[PDB]
Amino acid sequence: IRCIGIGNRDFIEGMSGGTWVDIVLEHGGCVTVMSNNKPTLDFELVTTTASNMAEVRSYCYEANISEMASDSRCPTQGEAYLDKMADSQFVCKRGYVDRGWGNGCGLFGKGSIVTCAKFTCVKKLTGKSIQPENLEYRVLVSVHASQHGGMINNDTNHQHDKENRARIDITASAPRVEVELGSFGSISMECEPRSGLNFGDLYYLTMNNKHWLVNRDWFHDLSLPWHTGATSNNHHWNNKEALVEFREAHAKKQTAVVLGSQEGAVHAALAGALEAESDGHKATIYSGHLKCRLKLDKLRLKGMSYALCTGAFTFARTPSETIHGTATVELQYAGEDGPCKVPIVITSDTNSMASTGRLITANPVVTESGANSKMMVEIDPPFGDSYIIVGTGTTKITHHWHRAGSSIGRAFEATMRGAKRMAVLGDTAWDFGSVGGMFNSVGKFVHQVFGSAFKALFGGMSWFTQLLIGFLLIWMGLNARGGTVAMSFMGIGAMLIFLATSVS
Amino acid sequence: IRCIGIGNRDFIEGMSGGTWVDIVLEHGGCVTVMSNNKPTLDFELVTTTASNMAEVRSYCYEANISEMASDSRCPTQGEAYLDKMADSQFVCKRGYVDRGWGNGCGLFGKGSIVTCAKFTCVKKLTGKSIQPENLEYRVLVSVHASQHGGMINNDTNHQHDKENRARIDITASAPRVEVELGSFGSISMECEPRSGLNFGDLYYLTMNNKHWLVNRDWFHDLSLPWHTGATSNNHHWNNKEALVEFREAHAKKQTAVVLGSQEGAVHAALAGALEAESDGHKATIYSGHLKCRLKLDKLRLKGMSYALCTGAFTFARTPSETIHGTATVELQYAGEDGPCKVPIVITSDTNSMASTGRLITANPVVTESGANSKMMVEIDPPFGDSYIIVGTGTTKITHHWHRAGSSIGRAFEATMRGAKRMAVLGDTAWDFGSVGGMFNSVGKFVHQVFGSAFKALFGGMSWFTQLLIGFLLIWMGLNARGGTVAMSFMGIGAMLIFLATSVS
Amino acid sequence: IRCIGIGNRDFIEGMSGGTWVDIVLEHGGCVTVMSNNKPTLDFELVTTTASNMAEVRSYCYEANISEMASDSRCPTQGEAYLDKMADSQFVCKRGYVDRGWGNGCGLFGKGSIVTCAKFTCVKKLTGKSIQPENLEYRVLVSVHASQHGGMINNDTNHQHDKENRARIDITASAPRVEVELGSFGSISMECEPRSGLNFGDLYYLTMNNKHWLVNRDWFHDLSLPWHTGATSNNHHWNNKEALVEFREAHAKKQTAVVLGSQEGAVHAALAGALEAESDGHKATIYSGHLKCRLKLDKLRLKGMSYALCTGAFTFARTPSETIHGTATVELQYAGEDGPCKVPIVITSDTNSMASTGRLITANPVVTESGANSKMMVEIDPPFGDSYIIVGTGTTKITHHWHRAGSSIGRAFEATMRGAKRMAVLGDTAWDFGSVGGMFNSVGKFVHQVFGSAFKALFGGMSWFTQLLIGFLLIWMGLNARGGTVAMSFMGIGAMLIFLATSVS
Amino acid sequence: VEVTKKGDTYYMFADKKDAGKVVTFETESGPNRCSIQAMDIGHMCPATMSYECPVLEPQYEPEDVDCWCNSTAAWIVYGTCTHKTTGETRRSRRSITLPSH
Amino acid sequence: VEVTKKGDTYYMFADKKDAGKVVTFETESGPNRCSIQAMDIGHMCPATMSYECPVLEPQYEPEDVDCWCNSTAAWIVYGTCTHKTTGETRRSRRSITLPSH
Amino acid sequence: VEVTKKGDTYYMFADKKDAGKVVTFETESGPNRCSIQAMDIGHMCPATMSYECPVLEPQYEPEDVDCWCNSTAAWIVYGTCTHKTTGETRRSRRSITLPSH
Amino acid sequence: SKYLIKVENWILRNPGYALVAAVIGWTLGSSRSQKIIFVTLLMLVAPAYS
Amino acid sequence: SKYLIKVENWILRNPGYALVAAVIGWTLGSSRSQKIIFVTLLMLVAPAYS
Amino acid sequence: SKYLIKVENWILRNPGYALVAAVIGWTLGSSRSQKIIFVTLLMLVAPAYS
Ligand SMILES: *[C@@H]1O[C@H](CO)[C@@H](O)[C@H](O)[C@H]1NC(C)=O
Ligand SMILES: *[C@@H]1O[C@H](CO)[C@@H](O)[C@H](O)[C@H]1NC(C)=O
Ligand SMILES: *[C@@H]1O[C@H](CO)[C@@H](O)[C@H](O)[C@H]1NC(C)=O
């Protein structure tokens, strides 16, 4: 039920006999996977986790100085000398100053003056690199089990039945994971962290308990003191003159000064930069998509063998409507019959009693055996006016529903979305290895690209007339001697035969 | 035996009746000379010796100064003067400095100041020239006398029988030398030190007990004090201002300073230079080839008249194989029969007993009359598999041997090497003087260029069939009226007749 | 005689009856004007004089300051104010400085500080403009009066007979001048100062008793204090901040400093500039040519009526030769006959006695009546060998002379020079006013362009044969029906008739 | 030092000798002790630097200030030249350059 | 002020209180009277400015010099901070700017 | 210091100890007090700097001169080396470079 | 809008009878546009029998 | 390699008989290439009589 | 050089006789170049009668 209130929601349906199915997950969206006999699953990607990041360079915005010393020699004495020059922690500058009888020596000529002082970095910021083997994605998996749908369980402490929700950590070391959903069964996932945001031109900047991302060509352009890329208590700094300002000149000395806090300059320069969050030493990124392949072999239903409900069904409120034309129904059941299957139908008139639409949640069931229990389901009503009927006998309730739009419009939108998805799945879509899965791959993707329109167009899914139409179309394409008219017709005929062979 | 372990080894064979023979010696290789009735000789060039080298120029890298003096005159007094100006050991510089009432005289103008100081060269390096008449080459001559072949005699102190090895000093004064090999006989050598490394654009640089070679166009380009080679206690120097730095400008004086040791600069500049070694005043060069002509008139064998060995022959170890496809055999003889000829044959099968290969060492013999003695020989096995048999009677021993490659390949390689050698021998190859030696010269070089293939190709050296083939080829070339078919055929026929007339 | 030693010397000859004649004077050359009955004149241009030049702008390189004052206000007080701001002689600058409790007031914000000081220009340079009405040219006029030719009279104090030399000041106000040469007569000159060096893109820079000329497109580009030319004791300056360097603002003050003498910078920038000289307020320029027109109406000879010399003539030295093939002869006369005409002839042989050349100095005469007097003359010998004869009777002296070159070569060179001169005389060459002077103008310039070749080519100046040649050429051109052959021939015939009608 | 008043404002003519020492004078409020810490003070000559230095509370120590009095704000003035040679320091060393041509 | 010698050179530990006054000490040559005109002198704290100030003849006036003694050249050292708050003045106001992106 | 005369000219052999002090000697004119302000003076050793220092009138201050006597011009000479180790300073640091090849 | 979706859903519910009616009305027009009008007539009267 | 050197040495040992066999087998082919195959056959069978 | 200037000056001294001789020698040649040679002959022999 985690996929209900999401703006960017898709719909993926696989072949009836097709166990494998590929999907793409975006960091701001969700994916709903449904089948004929398998329960509906909902996949979401929460956060990109970066851990164990190496350090490349650290800059020092605010620094201090101490023990300023200077030494002056006038002409015919050579260059000035100081013992602290050989020390790596003391920075000095040389210069030439005018001298005379007022300064101690007689010959009038410019003298050599040197001035150095210590350098201590009181505050600093750091830059880290990001390697593909360090990334770790987190995906939550939910199951439509006719849950109550109440938002009271925000954290992961409790109120989360381990058979209804799960979390999976996809790492670059082992991309193959086995997910256990308890009574529902087990699934397999193989995710490939590719075609994401480039991490070869990005540096993770940590500064004053805040974090940003910067460009590598800009990080080296910054004009501040910097050290070598090693972990040392005290490291040989470089280009520290940019933080120590020397006066013009003096006949006997030179007084250096240190610049103030450069935090404001960095905050102003990083205005148009991306931000992130961090916990301890790990970082969280909210950008990046993922491609995955799911194997659904041991996944089954939970209430397929249950009986019918012989109690009283009642609406809890007016059924709401989502942006994707899906209707959520919240039912309250009275009686004590235990877990029983919920008899619900969608038709065009109260006397017709003919299924006209499909259900997003397969096998709606009540979870507890209480007297007055509650449950929720999600369905897809047909375009136009429709009637939802719940229950049997003289106690069955009916409700009117309306939905705007057109079937052809939705079909074309879904076809375009599937084409865009298949275009995103450029690599790792087919397999050119052992033979026997190539035809399976071409059938699988033609299904994933055309089934949304096949189900919407070809009548009431009789599975008998469509085969005859395909046969007659193959015959019409066969008895044609002209070029470019038999190949396309036979291809379309085979496509329709295969799409009818799959689940409708 | 000095020519066994050499990578660059050649093989020279002369005409049967041809006494004179030309050779070329490289400083990194060896030459083996063999004949039909003459013992095998081995020539090598050890070192190029340069002695009595003249001196051209000497530089002074590190220098000292002392007794600095200066003299200043202000305007309306003329040029400054000092008594030490006329001395060649004192260097001074002139200049103009601003003067006033503070400096002694009244008029406000700039004056003339001069400053000189002594110059003493504490350390210096020297440059020598190399003349062709100073060079002296050293060539060692060894004789294959079935020596033990032990490498225990490295120097020239002892363990070198004077009848088996010799040393020759080829000088530019007398290029004709007569070599005495004791019982073997005497030979004559005429060597021409030509086409060697050019010594007209090279200078021998001596510095700090080390030596180098430099270019003449670069030696004069160096910017340092210098003086030519004149035997004296005190030398006059030129361009010494490059080592004495004067200060800017002072009204009453000028303090000069001397530069430090420039040994590091010279060591850095001479990084990509060639090096050598020296002993006392002589120098050793390891580059340069030589051309020689040998006259072998009084050279004979030593054990041609000896009898056969009726003792016991045994192998001392597995016979080794060199890079040139030559096999060394180390034999141990038991018995007391005195110096006797070693009966050894090379065949294809134990029952064939037919000589199929040649011997690099002519007339293998035992040197001492001891009970258990040892000896060594070097042979050339035929391509493929072969059997070496030593001794006669029921005590003869046999050994299997194999050698890869092809006879045509070796023949072509030897022909190309002989062509390259004859191309190196550009001058002093033929004689255009008295007639009678021109045909001898053309026959000699066609033999030295084609005998390696003649012996390898034309059958089993029967000396009877080859004459008939030559006669029939001459006849076929004679009865042909067409052009360009009789000249080449007659030439090839005469070439083959001559090559069969010579030694095979 | 002022035109003898000049490299760029021309020769101008006018028509016999033609009084007016135009000439061009260059600042580095001379002009010689000769006629049949008029004495030879020599015109030269000495210096271009510029006076009464207006002032455009003045710069101040070295300046002083005094009475520096400042005023600072911190936030919640408004802008700073000072009474000296409204004064034009005090320059101030504003700024914003950080303040706090350490600086006097409470609120922690940055304030407004202003600082001004007086400005007094101790030394300055000036810029003047040059107008055409200010220029004044000076031309010296000499007369060939057989003067001694001694260079002992350099200045204008004495030793300059007022009838032999004169000076003329050509101004833009009155270009018409009347020259009096004493006994020789009077001439008229009309000079037009046109086509000279452009004075619309040049500024006359005066600095430290030195003077230069600069470009207007650089004079305004200089970044220094400046003020226009206004007669006053105290001037208002603009853009003086370029000479006063303000120290970084302190907590509540600002100390300004003044730059040193910028004379070195100006001397370095004016390295590639033109220089000149000045006297008082006038300037002297050595570049610029001039065009003039001379009217010779009242000019006559001085010794035309004198008698012959019956004394003794002698050479004073070997006659010299100038670059223009002219021969100077220095004669010494013995006897007391008073001013008498010098009988001199130029011929080809001592017995021929036929005038073959012309004289550059007309009517050579002795000036004094002394016993032993001296005189000088300048003649043009014919190409080849010639004899100069001086005197009559048995006391006449002869001298040989030789001159290389060819008559046709000199004729062509003079024709090309005359063509160049006529091309320089673009405007004011002809007159398009009243009729009657147009034919005079075309004849005058065709004469000035072709007479140098006419005199050199057409025989011995018989004045009788040339007319017959012209008549026959006119007849040959007349009896010709073909086009482009009668017009050119008739034109050349008329040209030759006119050139023969003039003086030869 | 000389103490005058021109237009209800006090001027303190301080020469070079009184450098780094305090001075007490009288104002309309009463006695005023004012300290002078002028570092760039020079000899007496026409080049005179003048700047107001302000009154401040005793508890707050001066900071980057070389003149302070406690009655009111006092304007200080003193010459700035070298060895009474009627010459300013003019040690700017800007070395302004001009275009060649 | 404290006067010590470490390696044949004299160090004068001068605090804030001794600012603008002379002091007499003893050297190997004899008595030495040395004047101190330190303008940027501060309180005692780790930030210590130290500079040798040279001997000169009394017949010359000091030029651009704030320390001079007459026995030899003497090395002066003094702290530079504000109100003993262990903080330097650091009033540079350079305001270095960085590229945006 | 030693004072000698060789050829009507006075030489003053001054060692390192007499550095910065005046000395009085006798000449044909009378007593002469001559001051020496040599800064780079060294110990006694073969490297000897010698330069004439001139007489001048006492009513003028010295401008660029470190030696001045008042009878005549006097030639001063003194060694220039370090710690009497028979070694000159030779601190030029020119570092002349040679072509490689 | 209000009626197009209804007839569209009706066609998609039982397309066989709809195609039968369409092919019946296709051959009952004198001109091409007349056949188009007749089949759109059947398309419009299809939802309500009345 | 292993057999080429053997047959080469055999040919070079007794070239007369080898050339006799070659000239005999040269004239026993119908075409040029057939003669070449026949002589290479003789070349190959030359080492071992069997 | 040495003789050209002399004959040139001679021609310029008395051009009538020179032109007479030139026009006389012009009509005594068989070809154009021959006439040119004959007139240059007269030009050269003009200075010295001999
Ligand atoms: C200024 O401060 C001094 C400090 O002792 C004090 O004596 C004087 O009275 C004060 N003047 C005032 C408050 O006007
Ligand atoms: C330094 O000068 C002072 C000035 O009074 C004097 O008392 C003292 O003796 C001098 N020290 C010397 C000469 O060593
Ligand atoms: C040099 O000057 C001193 C000044 O005290 C004087 O005593 C001495 O006599 C002078 N020497 C002369 C004039 O030779």
Author numbering:
A (entry chain A), B (entry chain D), C (entry chain G): 1 to 504
D (entry chain H), E (entry chain B), F (entry chain E): 1 to 101
G (entry chain C), H (entry chain F), I (entry chain I): 120 to 169
Excerpt from the publication:
In contrast to their mature counterparts, immature virions possess 60 protruding spike-like trimers of precursor membrane (prM)-E complexes (prM3E3). The pr domain of prM binds to E, obscuring the fusion peptide and thereby preventing unproductive fusion within the already infected cell.
Within the context of the spike, three copies of prM1E1 form an asymmetric trimer (i.e., not following C3-symmetry), in which the three pr domains sitting at the tips of E come together and interact. Our data resolve how the furin recognition site on pr interacts with neighboring E and thus is sequestered in the trimeric spike and how prM is anchored to E via a strictly conserved and mutation-sensitive histidine. E and prM are anchored in the viral membrane via their respective membrane-associated regions. We suggest that occlusion of the furin site within immature trimers is a critical adaptation for the virus because otherwise high levels of virus expression within an infected cell, combined with high local concentrations of furin recognition motifs on a viral surface could lead to some cleavage events in the ER or early Golgi.
